[PDB]
């Protein structure tokens, strides 16, 4: 019938199906997954061994 | 040759070799994954925090 | 003779936390969130193994 059992979320999207499960879990600002993705993007090459590129040692080969 | 040759050197050949970059070398270790404090909580109850 | 039994589901959990400045500093051993998650998973695995 008429759109009486209709609702919208905080972002302006409307759901017209009373039996459709609405998405949830949007109230946790600064989500941990977002923080992990941000760390992966803004800080690449973290934990890499670059000590070899500033070594003045003429011998770069390890032998017994 | 009445003395030893290089064929009698065993432990020196077997130990793995790594390259050093200073007179002091540092490394980190992992000891535990957390203290033993029980892992059962119940329905709709926030579990306790842990650290390594 | 016949019988009818019942089993009850139980819940396990743990919580991991990381402070904000720890996420900003330059840290070795790679990403910190992944390390904490791996530690939590291994601790839960040990707890499940002993509870079994």
């Amino acid at each position: 019938p008429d759109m009486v059992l209709a609702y919208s979320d905080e972002r302006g999207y409307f759901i017209f199906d009373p039996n459709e499960e609405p998405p949830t879990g949007s109230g946790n600002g600064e989500t941990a997954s977002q923080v992990e993705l941000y760390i992966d993007l803004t800080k690449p090459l973290e934990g890499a061994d670059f000590r070899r590129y500033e070594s003045p040692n003429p011998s770069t080969i390890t032998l017994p | 040759n009445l003395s030893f040759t290089d064929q009698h050197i065993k432990f020196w050949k077997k130990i793995p070799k790594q390259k050093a970059y200073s007179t002091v070398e540092q490394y980190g270790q992992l000891l535990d994954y957390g203290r033993s404090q029980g892992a059962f909580v119940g329905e709709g109850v926030l579990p306790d925090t842990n650290d390594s | 003779t016949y019988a009818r039994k019942a089993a009850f589901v139980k819940f396990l959990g743990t919580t991991r936390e990381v402070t904000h400045p720890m996420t900003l500093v330059n840290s070795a051993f790679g990403n910190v969130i992944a390390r904490q998650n791996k530690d939590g998973i291994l601790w839960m695995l040990k707890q499940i193994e002993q509870a079994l």
């Binding site: 934990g47 890499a48 061994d49 000590r51 | 050093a20 970059y21 200073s22 007179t23 002091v24 070398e25 540092q26 490394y27 980190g28 270790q29 992992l30 | 070795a28 051993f29």
Partner: peptide
Amino acid sequence: ALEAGHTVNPLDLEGGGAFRVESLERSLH
């Protein structure tokens, strides 16, 4: 002469030991 030394505490580095950066293995054992 200028020597590197075997000093760990950063606040006690003197002479040639003040030129040394830390050498940290990137693998967690």
